[PDB]
Symmetry: C2
Subunit: 167 residues, 2 copies
């Protein structure tokens, strides 16, 4: 099968969980509306190996054997980066997942202050994009909007990528 793993922060493991529910044939799930019935047949050929929510630097570093840059802001509950570092970390997490679990497609996401970053790494190519929503992990400004936008954009891009590269 086509195997997928994700290491997600702002999107709370929902990109991986959605991929899993779609693949397994769930008839109701939060982001099902993004999939056509044809997309859902293609998704039966995908298996999720793991979908991790990894807010801790020490968590990410220990589970994936990578090393992350120092946070840009002090924040007790999650590593907190500005945009430049979120883009760097999404790539480092996707790459580390791909090495640790040997999957076809790895997905990293992270967002501190700004639009956040999602990296989708396949066997062929690496895709890196921001969300549409500026938010702030610490003040909570726009954080739910950013989360929902990031999940939707992550899944839309994942489906485009899967179809382009694998179907």
């Amino acid at each position: 099968m086509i195997t997928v793993a994700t290491a997600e922060c702002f999107t709370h493991a929902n990109i991986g969980l959605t991929i899993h529910k779609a693949a397994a044939g769930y008839e109701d799930f939060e982001f099902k509306y993004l999939f056509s019935e044809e997309d859902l047949k293609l998704m039966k050929n995908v298996r999720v190996i793991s979908a991790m929510f990894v807010p801790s630097i020490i968590g990410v570093e220990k589970l994936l054997d990578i090393k992350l840059p120092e946070p840009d802001f002090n924040y007790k509950y999650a590593k907190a980066y500005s945009e430049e570092k979120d883009l760097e970390v999404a790539k480092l997490m996707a790459e580390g997942l791909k090495k640790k679990l040997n999957v076809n497609i790895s997905i990293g996401s992270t967002a501190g202050v700004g639009r956040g970053a999602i990296c989708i790494l396949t066997d062929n190519n690496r895709y890196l994009f921001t969300s549409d929503v500026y938010a702030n992990l610490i003040t909570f400004e726009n954080i739910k909007e950013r989360q929902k936008n990031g999940i939707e954009k992550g899944i839309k891009r994942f489906l485009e990528i899967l179809k382009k590269e694998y179907f």
Copy 2:
């Protein structure tokens, strides 16, 4: 702070994600009704290191450096066990995660055919219990109700344990 990590299957990382939203002070979240006002103050002292959804045997094994038993049933999208092995696996995952990440409190959950299993392992004690809902991961029979009860029972027990042991 009190650190927590989770390795969840049937509960979809929602035990750990709920713990994180309560601890970070989210104003509204799906299972907030489980927390009293005093509970939410206590929760500010908790940090989530990772909450992982790990439906594959290979995923759990590689991320925690453990070995799990062979599945009882053939099923493509997730490891599939009888209740006796679910009870073994929830323990093996909670113990492996606590050694991998050195957290105060580790939680594992798994459910195939039957009521499933949740393990809460603290610095002091190991708790292990089934959910209250018989379901079947392969047919989807009652899986939604088992998931909800598993998250509710997991959180309700986690709070009782956190207060008894840490407060």
